[PDB]
Design a binder for this molecule. Structure first.
Ligand SMILES: [Hg+2]
Ligand SMILES: [Hg+2]
Length: 92
């Protein structure tokens, strides 16, 4: 059962873009199909989405530009481990 996480430092959050992390052994083909499934389920509900990147090689999953309203839908997708809202990093 998948969980959601966002930056506790509220000025550092970047809402509207989410990293969907799939379970460790998920294959690239499964990541892409999950991403397209999200987009189709979203479109059915009247929501625009953009898949910005599909990850494989370290962590399986994808980066999606979408409204936060779709988060409970996305957490119910096959293979989902967790979802993290994007946030800022800074030169030290
Ligand atoms: Hg953060
Ligand atoms: Hg964060």
């Amino acid at each position: 059962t998948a969980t959601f996480h966002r930056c506790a430092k509220d000025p550092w959050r970047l809402p509207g873009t989410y990293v969907v992390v799939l379970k460790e052994e998920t294959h690239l083909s499964q990541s892409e199909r999950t991403a397209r499934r999200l987009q189709a389920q979203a479109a059915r509900r009247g929501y625009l989405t953009k898949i910005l990147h599909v990850f494989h090689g370290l962590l399986p999953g994808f980066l999606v530009k979408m409204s936060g309203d779709l988060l409970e839908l996305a957490l119910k997708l096959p293979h989902v481990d967790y979802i993290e809202e994007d946030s800022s990093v800074f030169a030290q």
